[PDB]
Amino acid sequence: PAVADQLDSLAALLTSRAQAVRNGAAVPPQQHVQLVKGLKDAAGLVNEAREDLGDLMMSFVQVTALRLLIKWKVFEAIPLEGTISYADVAARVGIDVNLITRLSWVLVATGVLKQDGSDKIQHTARSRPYASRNPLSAMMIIGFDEYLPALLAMPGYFDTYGKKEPFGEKHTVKAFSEGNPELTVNQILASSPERLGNMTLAMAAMENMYPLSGVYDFSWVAAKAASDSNRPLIVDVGGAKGHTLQAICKDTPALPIERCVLEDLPRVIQVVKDTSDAGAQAPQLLGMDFNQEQPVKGAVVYLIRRCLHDYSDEQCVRILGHLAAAMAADSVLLIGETVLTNPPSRPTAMMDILLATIGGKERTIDAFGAVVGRAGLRIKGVCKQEGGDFSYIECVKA
Amino acid sequence: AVADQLDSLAALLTSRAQAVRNGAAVPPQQHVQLVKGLKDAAGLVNEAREDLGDLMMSFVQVTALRLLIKWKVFEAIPLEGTISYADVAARVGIDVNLITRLSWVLVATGVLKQDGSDKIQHTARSRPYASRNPLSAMMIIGFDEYLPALLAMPGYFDTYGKKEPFGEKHTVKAFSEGNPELTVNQILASSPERLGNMTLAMAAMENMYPLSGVYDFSWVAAKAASDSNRPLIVDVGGAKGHTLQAICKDTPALPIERCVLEDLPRVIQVVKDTSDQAPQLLGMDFNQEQPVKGAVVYLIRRCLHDYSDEQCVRILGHLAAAMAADSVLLIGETVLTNPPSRPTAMMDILLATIGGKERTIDAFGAVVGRAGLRIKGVCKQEGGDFSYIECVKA
Ligand SMILES: [Cl-]
């Protein structure tokens, strides 16, 4: 049938990458992602129904072994190079060596760890990313702690609140899973500085993924900066750090950073000015709110990155409607979000359901167009990034 | 180095391609070496962030499966052909946007197939979850009962100690459900086919090895003629009675009527209701002394891995006391290799949530010797880790 020639093309794709890595030739990101998808596509076609369920069960146990070994700092006690006995690992962390062995055996079977002989363990390239508390290990931590319990609570949640798309800050699946559906996600996290800190580090790991500078041509904004010496240039709505504004103005020095506006919650802006060099050139820091008018009028470019996916279409129309009101005829709005294909890929579909636990969602270009059009805007273009669906949707006033 | 691993996998996919074209089965060893490698290639090609994504998806994929099963979505999809998301939504009376987002998960993973922009259809990987069968029961069990125990483990070890969980009391499962003072089987006796979902589901982890073609029972038949009243085969915790009928239909002069099926009274009562020629049925608790004395062969299959080492010592100790000098005890269990395989290591941590574990042949030899027994031999499954440990009185 058709399952037979899917294997043939992945085979040919594998030979092409084999000779490529033989020649040391660099691999474009789109080729990397196609091989990643092709390998996983074949694994489901080759697996029977029982093997699929067995694989899903192993990933669960594997994630549980990763979380426990991260929490117990077992990866950190294993040297980055060389081997070490299970008993020595157990002495370094003060834990029963059966528990260490049985949990490490899980990661030995899946290739995350490699066992040497009958009782010695070593790191691999797949386990060193968890040998410390870092951006990626934080993502696993908050994934296990903050989102998996909400996935489990979903059958009971939809029975309680109705089988509809979860939207809004209260009565989220996450809060329902915590036992306090009347509390927002931020209220639950503010009660624990450790849980907040891991989420901060984990979220900072994803804001850094697809840079705006270098993939969007700001040369036309340079012309606007010269004609009007006083109009604001770039406004980063919800820009969190100011990292993106620094990158844009560094690569395009025609845009002075002090002519750009960084906008976020007052508590987020307080952190920025708390840690920033007071003697260095900095953008305008403005404490604002999504639901109210955009304070900066007539700016050349407005950015709203990784924000609209937290809210429903109706909230998104309000947010975009405030921007459209403040925008000039020549203004441009850049929406930085994942743009789902139909049907969507595995990592973006996975993200879409995770966002449902907190009242968000991912959107196709069709859903973005409807929300954009209802806010008095229109889509002008889409800048899709290599090896993924994260894009900058260029919008303009209708 | 890394290059020829891709070529070897590529060559395996070439071999697999022609055979599925002709409807050919491919050797099982060739299927095994293709499933592996496909995993190993994924482990080498995936970036760390992509591998973390794969693991997180498994949880979202199981949640989409669970929700669409509970909502009768697989029941509303036609057998053959496609159906629009709007129609599926109207049949089950659910928000079409919610139906589409959850089905997109299964479409992306290959469980479901999307035709065009808005139409969906069954595949060979979705059909088992449209009905009540061991496979669909297991996945429901994995979500409803095993998954909460796994998520509660970081907290469980924070309250009881970062040590091996053991015993029927204060299990991770009982902890995860908010009643740590309950035992696992009190929890399953909450509703009668909450246990019934479990006994149906254990046919999905039922990688069945028939034992009859594994162990030579001919010497037992010779004992049957030498002692006309002696019990022959006692199946301790045999539940079904499938093993006993398989052995007796396959071994001549080993009558089923001279064998005993032993399990819990409530299990024995279910057997008698569905059975009708037959072995002796005995309601029992294998934590207490064994009533049928001096049987030629005692069987205990897939029971010891649910319990701690000391509890298995007591269980086996009752059997040893009842055995004659020529009696044989066959332990049907997974025998862990060091290091273990993927399914045996996965099952090892699942059993930890109920105070059990999988054991090597050394760990088995330790508990066997504490009961008054010694290992006489091991009959191993080819292509797996399930074994039959032949034990005799020490
Ligand atoms: Cl062990």
Side-chain angles (χ1 to χ4, degrees):
Chain A
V3 315
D5 310 70
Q6 281 210 247
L7 314 173
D8 273 322
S9 161
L10 176 65
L13 179 65
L14 279 170
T15 81
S16 324
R17 197 64 41 87
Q19 44 165 329
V21 79
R22 282 191 321 212
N23 267 59
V27 182
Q30 53 270 20
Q31 313 294 290
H32 176 30
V33 171
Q34 180 171 0
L35 182 54
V36 164
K37 172 175 161 57
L39 285 176
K40 285 153 198 185
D41 277 340
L45 270 177
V46 170
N47 270 342
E48 77 153 294
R50 284 122 212 91
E51 282 174 302
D52 258 343
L53 183 48
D55 287 356
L56 297 171
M57 278 284 118
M58 168 82 281
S59 304
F60 295 177
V61 170
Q62 196 187 345
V63 171
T64 306
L66 284 175
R67 182 65 186 97
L68 290 171
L69 263 45
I70 284 172
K71 186 177 190 294
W72 300 344
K73 303 190 187 310
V74 168
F75 294 123
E76 309 183 2
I78 302 179
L80 297 192
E81 279 150 2
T83 65
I84 182 174
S85 80
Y86 287 119
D88 277 1
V89 176
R92 292 183 172 189
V93 301
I95 298 186
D96 174 17
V97 55
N98 281 117
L99 198 49
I100 300 298
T101 302
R102 288 172 65 183
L103 283 167
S104 320
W105 270 348
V106 162
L107 308 182
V108 173
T110 63
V112 172
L113 287 176
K114 178 168 152 212
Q115 183 166 302
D116 165 25
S118 81
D119 67 327
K120 285 204 253 164
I121 195 72
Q122 81 193 38
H123 274 287
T124 72
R126 300 173 60 188
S127 62
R128 298 192 184 100
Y130 304 95
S132 78
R133 180 178 174 265
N134 58 70
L136 183 128
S137 70
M139 288 212 268
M140 163 55 88
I141 282 175
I142 59 103
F144 191 92
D145 293 347
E146 310 295 338
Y147 286 92
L148 292 192
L151 301 187
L152 291 209
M154 253 191 288
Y157 175 92
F158 289 118
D159 281 355
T160 305
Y161 298 94
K163 312 180 180 62
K164 270 167 169 51
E165 273 187 305
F167 288 132
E169 45 171 23
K170 293 174 62 143
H171 303 157
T172 64
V173 195
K174 170 56 177 297
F176 171 85
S177 87
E178 281 259 331
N180 302 307
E182 297 303 321
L183 301 188
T184 71
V185 178
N186 284 328
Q187 291 175 344
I188 298 168
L189 296 166
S191 147
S192 157
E194 187 198 358
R195 288 174 66 191
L196 211 182
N198 283 322
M199 197 81 109
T200 323
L201 184 65
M203 297 264 109
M206 288 196 287
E207 180 87 314
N208 199 257
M209 280 172 176
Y210 301 96
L212 178 51
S213 201
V215 317
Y216 178 85
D217 196 351
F218 286 101
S219 322
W220 69 274
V221 184
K224 297 286 182 172
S227 281
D228 194 326
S229 321
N230 284 266
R231 86 181 288 190
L233 297 179
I234 320 293
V235 174
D236 194 4
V237 187
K241 315 291 222 213
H243 164 278
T244 299
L245 282 176
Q246 307 288 340
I248 292 177
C249 296
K250 171 196 172 206
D251 294 337
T252 312
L255 320 178
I257 187 64
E258 69 257 18
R259 292 183 60 178
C260 302
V261 177
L262 169 60
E263 293 178 349
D264 210 294
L265 303 177
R267 52 182 160 112
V268 186
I269 298 296
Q270 190 273 334
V271 179
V272 166
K273 60 178 61 164
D274 187 71
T275 185
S276 303
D277 182 15
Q281 277 160 125
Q284 303 155 51
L285 303 183
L286 192 43
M288 47 65 87
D289 193 358
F290 279 178
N291 77 328
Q292 293 197 159
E293 198 170 50
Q294 166 55 223
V296 181
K297 317 297 182 182
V300 183
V301 178
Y302 293 84
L303 322 171
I304 178 150
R305 191 177 188 258
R306 303 182 192 265
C307 289
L308 297 188
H309 72 247
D310 280 336
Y311 311 100
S312 67
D313 289 12
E314 289 61 39
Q315 322 173 250
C316 286
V317 169
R318 303 190 224 109
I319 294 169
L320 293 180
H322 295 323
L323 298 164
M327 283 145 77
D330 60 344
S331 295
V332 161
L333 170 66
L334 296 180
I335 300 176
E337 296 287 8
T338 285
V339 172
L340 298 182
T341 54
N342 190 9
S345 69
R346 265 184 272 259
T348 58
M350 168 272 260
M351 188 44 78
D352 183 30
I353 308 301
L354 291 192
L355 287 179
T357 68
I358 58 185
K361 76 173 298 173
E362 308 278 26
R363 292 176 169 90
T364 59
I365 197 59
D366 322 306
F368 274 124
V371 166
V372 157
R374 287 200 282 270
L377 299 170
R378 63 154 83 93
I379 290 179
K380 186 173 183 294
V382 176
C383 301
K384 192 181 87 65
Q385 305 297 274
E386 281 56 79
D389 294 308
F390 191 89
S391 322
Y392 293 94
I393 306 169
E394 191 167 9
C395 307
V396 84
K397 290 188 74 163
Chain B
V2 173
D4 291 351
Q5 176 108 30
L6 322 181
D7 289 309
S8 99
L9 177 62
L12 289 174
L13 289 161
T14 71
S15 182
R16 182 53 144 267
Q18 323 145 350
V20 56
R21 254 180 259 170
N22 310 13
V26 200
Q29 182 45 40
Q30 214 183 129
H31 167 75
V32 165
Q33 67 189 169
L34 173 58
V35 172
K36 198 172 93 71
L38 270 179
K39 307 281 186 59
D40 295 348
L44 294 174
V45 175
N46 267 337
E47 285 163 1
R49 220 147 283 200
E50 292 170 320
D51 222 299
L52 173 56
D54 303 339
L55 296 173
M56 271 292 127
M57 165 85 266
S58 312
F59 290 89
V60 174
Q61 180 179 5
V62 85
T63 310
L65 283 167
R66 188 70 184 90
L67 291 170
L68 298 193
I69 284 184
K70 177 182 172 66
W71 297 348
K72 318 297 181 178
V73 168
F74 295 116
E75 300 187 354
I77 298 170
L79 301 70
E80 223 156 318
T82 59
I83 183 180
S84 68
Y85 290 118
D87 291 326
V88 183
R91 292 183 176 185
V92 305
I94 300 184
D95 181 14
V96 62
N97 301 333
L98 186 48
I99 296 302
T100 307
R101 288 169 67 188
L102 293 173
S103 304
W104 272 348
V105 156
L106 302 191
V107 169
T109 56
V111 182
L112 287 168
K113 174 163 121 93
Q114 178 168 303
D115 177 60
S117 97
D118 60 340
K119 305 217 171 191
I120 204 158
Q121 81 175 45
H122 267 291
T123 65
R125 301 166 67 194
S126 69
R127 285 183 180 95
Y129 300 110
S131 64
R132 171 178 171 84
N133 49 78
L135 187 80
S136 67
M138 178 91 262
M139 172 268 135
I140 290 180
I141 283 301
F143 186 92
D144 292 356
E145 288 186 61
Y146 284 126
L147 205 36
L150 300 173
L151 297 191
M153 257 153 82
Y156 175 94
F157 296 120
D158 272 359
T159 78
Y160 294 106
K162 312 172 210 299
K163 45 169 144 286
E164 233 180 345
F166 66 106
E168 300 187 53
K169 43 194 63 188
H170 295 257
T171 62
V172 182
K173 181 178 171 54
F175 175 80
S176 70
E177 269 178 83
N179 321 313
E181 231 62 28
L182 272 294
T183 71
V184 168
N185 294 347
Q186 296 172 285
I187 307 202
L188 294 162
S190 98
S191 266
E193 71 282 74
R194 194 188 203 263
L195 191 271
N197 292 352
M198 258 312 287
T199 172
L200 168 65
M202 297 274 80
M205 281 293 130
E206 243 277 15
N207 315 43
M208 200 131 48
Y209 226 63
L211 173 55
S212 314
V214 186
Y215 187 87
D216 188 7
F217 285 97
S218 54
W219 68 278
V220 185
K223 300 270 193 171
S226 301
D227 198 355
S228 307
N229 297 333
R230 184 179 190 178
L232 296 183
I233 307 178
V234 173
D235 199 2
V236 185
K240 205 292 211 161
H242 186 308
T243 315
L244 279 179
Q245 53 145 299
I247 294 170
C248 293
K249 62 176 99 133
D250 293 339
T251 325
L254 214 170
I256 184 68
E257 319 98 50
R258 291 184 59 177
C259 297
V260 191
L261 174 59
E262 284 175 359
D263 209 300
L264 298 164
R266 279 82 221 172
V267 169
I268 293 288
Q269 183 63 60
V270 167
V271 173
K272 216 171 321 213
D273 293 341
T274 73
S275 293
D276 267 298
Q277 179 175 4
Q280 288 286 340
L281 302 178
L282 204 150
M284 66 96 70
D285 185 356
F286 52 60
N287 292 318
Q288 309 185 257
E289 69 101 49
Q290 162 63 240
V292 184
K293 257 65 172 172
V296 181
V297 173
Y298 290 84
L299 303 183
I300 176 148
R301 297 173 27 84
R302 298 196 158 96
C303 278
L304 291 182
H305 62 232
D306 286 337
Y307 305 100
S308 66
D309 285 349
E310 182 45 44
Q311 186 157 4
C312 293
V313 167
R314 291 206 201 88
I315 290 166
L316 294 179
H318 294 309
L319 299 189
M323 279 192 264
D326 58 350
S327 299
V328 152
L329 170 67
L330 295 183
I331 299 174
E333 286 284 357
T334 290
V335 170
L336 280 200
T337 58
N338 184 12
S341 57
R342 290 169 183 259
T344 64
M346 178 271 288
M347 188 69 168
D348 188 51
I349 302 307
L350 289 192
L351 289 167
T353 68
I354 65 167
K357 66 182 296 171
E358 305 283 7
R359 292 179 178 84
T360 71
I361 196 56
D362 288 334
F364 272 125
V367 311
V368 153
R370 263 186 270 161
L373 301 176
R374 63 176 191 89
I375 298 182
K376 188 180 178 58
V378 178
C379 302
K380 179 195 162 67
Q381 143 183 70
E382 171 234 1
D385 288 320
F386 200 80
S387 310
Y388 288 98
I389 309 167
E390 186 178 31
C391 305
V392 295
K393 296 191 75 163

